[PDB]
Amino acid sequence: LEGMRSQDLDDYLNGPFTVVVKESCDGMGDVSEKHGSGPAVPEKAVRFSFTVMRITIEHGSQNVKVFEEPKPNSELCCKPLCLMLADESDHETLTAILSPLIAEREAMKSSELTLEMGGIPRTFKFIFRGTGYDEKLVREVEGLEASGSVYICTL
Amino acid sequence: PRQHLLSLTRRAQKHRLRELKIQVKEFADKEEGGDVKAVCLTLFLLALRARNEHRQADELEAIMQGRGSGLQPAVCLAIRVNTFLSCSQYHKMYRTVKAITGRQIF
Amino acid sequence: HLLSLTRRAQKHRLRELKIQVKEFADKEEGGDVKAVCLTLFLLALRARNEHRQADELEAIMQGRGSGLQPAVCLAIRVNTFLSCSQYHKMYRTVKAITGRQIFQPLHALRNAEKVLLPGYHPFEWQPPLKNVSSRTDVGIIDGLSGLASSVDEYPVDTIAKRFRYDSALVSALMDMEEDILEGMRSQDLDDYLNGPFTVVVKESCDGMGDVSEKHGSGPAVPEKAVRFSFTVMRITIEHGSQNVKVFEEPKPNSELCC
Amino acid sequence: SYAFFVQTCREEHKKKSVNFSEFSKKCSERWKKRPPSAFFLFCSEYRPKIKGEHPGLSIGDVAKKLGEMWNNTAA
Amino acid sequence: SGNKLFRRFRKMNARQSKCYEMEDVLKHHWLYTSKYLQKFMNAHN
Amino acid sequence: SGNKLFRRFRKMNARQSKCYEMEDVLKHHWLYTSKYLQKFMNAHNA
DNA sequence: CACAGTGATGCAAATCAAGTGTGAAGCCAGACAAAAACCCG
DNA sequence: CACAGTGATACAGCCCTTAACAAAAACCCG
Numbered sequence: 001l002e003g004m005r006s007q008d009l010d011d012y013l014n015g016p017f018t019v020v021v022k023e024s025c026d027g028m029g030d031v032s033e034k035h036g037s038g039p040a041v042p043e044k045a046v047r048f049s050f051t052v053m054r055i056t057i058e059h060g061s062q063n064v065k066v067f068e069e070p071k072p073n074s075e076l077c078c079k080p081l082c083l084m085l086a087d088e089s090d091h092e093t094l095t096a097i098l099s100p101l102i103a104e105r106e107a108m109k110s111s112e113l114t115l116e117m118g119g120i121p122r123t124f125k126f127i128f129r130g131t132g133y134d135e136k137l138v139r140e141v142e143g144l145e146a147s148g149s150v151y152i153c154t155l
Numbered sequence: 156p157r158q159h160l161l162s163l164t165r166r167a168q169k170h171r172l173r174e175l176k177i178q179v180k181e182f183a184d185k186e187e188g189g190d191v192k193a194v195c196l197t198l199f200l201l202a203l204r205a206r207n208e209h210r211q212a213d214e215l216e217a218i219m220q221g222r223g224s225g226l227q228p229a230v231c232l233a234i235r236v237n238t239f240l241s242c243s244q245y246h247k248m249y250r251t252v253k254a255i256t257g258r259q260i261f
Numbered sequence: 262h263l264l265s266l267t268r269r270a271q272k273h274r275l276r277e278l279k280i281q282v283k284e285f286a287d288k289e290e291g292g293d294v295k296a297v298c299l300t301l302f303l304l305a306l307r308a309r310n311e312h313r314q315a316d317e318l319e320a321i322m323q324g325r326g327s328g329l330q331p332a333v334c335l336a337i338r339v340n341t342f343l344s345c346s347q348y349h350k351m352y353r354t355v356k357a358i359t360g361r362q363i364f365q366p367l368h369a370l371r372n373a374e375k376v377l378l379p380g381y382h383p384f385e386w387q388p389p390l391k392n393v394s395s396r397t398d399v400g401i402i403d404g405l406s407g408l409a410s411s412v413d414e415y416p417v418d419t420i421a422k423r424f425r426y427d428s429a430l431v432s433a434l435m436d437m438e439e440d441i442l443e444g445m446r447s448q449d450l451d452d453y454l455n456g457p458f459t460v461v462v463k464e465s466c467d468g469m470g471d472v473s474e475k476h477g478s479g480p481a482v483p484e485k486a487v488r489f490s491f492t493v494m495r496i497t498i499e500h501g502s503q504n505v506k507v508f509e510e511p512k513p514n515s516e517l518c519c
Numbered sequence: 520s521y522a523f524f525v526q527t528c529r530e531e532h533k534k535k536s537v538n539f540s541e542f543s544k545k546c547s548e549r550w551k552k553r554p555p556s557a558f559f560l561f562c563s564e565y566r567p568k569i570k571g572e573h574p575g576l577s578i579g580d581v582a583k584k585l586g587e588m589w590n591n592t593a594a
Numbered sequence: 595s596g597n598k599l600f601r602r603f604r605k606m607n608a609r610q611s612k613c614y615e616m617e618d619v620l621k622h623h624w625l626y627t628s629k630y631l632q633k634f635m636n637a638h639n
Numbered sequence: 640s641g642n643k644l645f646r647r648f649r650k651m652n653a654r655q656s657k658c659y660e661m662e663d664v665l666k667h668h669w670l671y672t673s674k675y676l677q678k679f680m681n682a683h684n685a
Numbered sequence: 686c687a688c689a690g691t692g693a694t695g696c697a698a699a700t701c702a703a704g705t706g707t708g709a710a711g712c713c714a715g716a717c718a719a720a721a722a723c724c725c726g
Numbered sequence: 727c728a729c730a731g732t733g734a735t736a737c738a739g740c741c742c743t744t745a746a747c748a749a750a751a752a753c754c755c756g
């Protein structure tokens with residue numbers, strides 16, 4: 001709302017808001033296991049998170065950005081989504097855990113969201129972009145070979 | 156043997172003011188809608204302004220509104236989260252402040 | 262609705278009821294509208310389960326500032342594992358929202374710290390300590406103790422900081438004044454006796470491991486740390502022909518007394 | 520305009536002004552800590568000198584005089 | 595940075611049990627990352 | 640038990656400098672073991 | 686072009702204190718304007 | 727018989743509302 005006010009727009013506008021987010025996922029080591037009952041949990045961890053980047057309304061003919069993260073690489077804006085104590089190399093478990101999220105993402109990629117802000121139904125659309133991945137995970141997920149292969153580039 | 160109005164407990168002061176309690180209730184529920192606390196603080200602010208005071212008026216406005224001398228739950232939640240306070244730690248601090256000061260700040 | 266009007270219009274509706282209230286205040290009290298209205302409002306507050314706001318009201322009725330001593334803020338800051346930065350953030354937030362000071366600022370805490378640290382209280386050993394200075398205001402003495410650090414002598418690759426032993430014992434004994442006083446008071450002993458107390462202290466030392474090193478200038482220090490500590494375990498007094506127990510640590514293996 | 524005629528009538532029946540109670544029904548037939556130091560004692564003792572010797576001015580001049588007197592003398 | 599915050603929360607801001615540590619850490623991190631609470635800390639303007 | 644406190648104080652309650660951390664950690668761990676300060680936190684039990 | 690810390694230090698800015706006379710913003714007795722939001726006309 | 731935590735859950739405790747009585751602490755009169 002403050003971004004809408006600062007760009008010389010009207011607050012009662014309910015146009016289609018264009019949102020773009022940033023996805024990330026990394027594995028972690030040296031996550032010690034605890035005593036007690038439960039399954040044989042490995043000593044590793046894999047995290048998955050998302051982060052909005054900017055919001056832009058189409059006003060008149062061209063576009064105008066309403067909000068954008070000033071500190072894109074800050075820890076105060078990395079919203080966690082999924083947390084599991086598994087191995088980033090275990091392809092079976094990794095896919096079994098991440099397939100529902102990917103299904104939800106694919107289903108959302110072609111829909112609009114009616115949402116109330118200040119008492120006015122607003123329309124939202126999303127553009128998902130995943131860049132917070134190291135080359136190892138990219139090679140493991142995109143169906144490529146390891147880093148020591150002869151094909152060296154992922155572009 | 157009348158000593159004073161504040162030299163009695165809540166129960167005894169209620170016994171002593173029951174008359175005007177019932178009267179204000181039965182005369183503010185007829186036409187004024189029926190909100191007791193509203194009429195109460197309005198009459199108090201009028202009797203205070205009568206003394207043309209601003210300090211006390213602003214104090215009771217802040218108290219009744221929830222802006223001064225006492226934090227909102229969202230505020231203390233933000234303080235507890237953004238300072239990495241554990242729930243046990245925060246409870247210890249809350250207990251200590253309430254015991255020493257005697258006024259619930261959190 | 263009601264009571265949501267501005268001036269010269271909210272009285273326009275409750276004028277009759279205020280007249281009745283002042284009539285009763287003239288009948289019984291004689292004109293004490295202030296006390297009767299305040300008490301009626303307090304009861305109206307307590308009727309709706311609002312003990313907090315009513316207690317705040319009856320506290321501000323006196324007109325005194327609810328403040329905290331710097332020692333209390335220091336104890337809260339230490340015993341709750343708070344860095345100076347987080348404490349400053351909380352202080353700033355509270356002072357800016359409430360519009361008043363409930364905690365003490367950082368300089369007050371830092372100033373109050375000097376009372377507890379060793380080298381603040383006077384004392385003297387009746388037999389003067391051999392090879393030990395008599396000055397009683399030293400703080401954190403260097404650990405190397407004036408060791409040669411030139412290029413000709415044995416190489417030095419360590420750093421250390423430590424207090425003076427006697428000053429540390431004096432500070433530890435002064436930190437437990439109320440405990441010893443209450444113990445003497447609980448043993449049918451007068452609290453003004455100056456008998457030759459007997460203090461028993463436990464000593465401990467152990468080297469740690471996996472101690473990471475920092476970048477920057479200075480000497481090349483190893484990745485191991487050794488610490489040395491003490492603990493006052495028991496204090497007794499010789500009254501008559503016995504040894505009355507005036508103090509004893511209830512939790513010796515705790516970290517709060519090492 | 521509601522006050523001009525009232526002010527004229529007030530001048531009228533006042534030229535023949537503290538009684539507003541008995542005037543209510545008149546318009547009906549018309550419109551129809553910190554321990555001080557040596558300097559604070561110096562002030563509290565030597566300000567009445569200039570406050571009583573020259574009361575024609577406010578104590579701003581007394582403060583100015585006491586200040587130029589303290590700056591010229593020792594402590 | 596979130597990995598660092600996770601290491602901190604799993605150790606000092608969660609129940610020490612396999613059955614509930616992850617929910618606690620996730621909820622605490624979600625609360626920490628929120629902006630509605632961070633505005634109350636910028637009470638200097 | 641105090642080794643734990645040492646580690647935590649060095650990681651979170653000291654200057655991150657090679658020639659300043661020792662005295663800071665020492666002073667903080669000394670202050671943390673003061674019964675005078677600990678009595679304040681237990682005043683509620685009175 | 687990571688960033689929110691981590692503590693001390695050092696300097697700049699706000700304030701308080703005592704001194705005291707005036708100056709000024711309220712409230713208040715009714716009151717009969719001046720909109721002004723309900724009803725529908 | 728190490729010990730200070732560590733967050734959600736449950737229950738006891740202690741406050742608050744209709745009840746007319748009824749027992750404890752004190753002057754006017756005798």
Ligand SMILES: [Ca+2]
Binds near residue numbers: 026027028029
């Ligand atoms: Ca990794």
Ligand SMILES: [Ca+2]
Binds near residue numbers: 467468469470
């Ligand atoms: Ca060891």
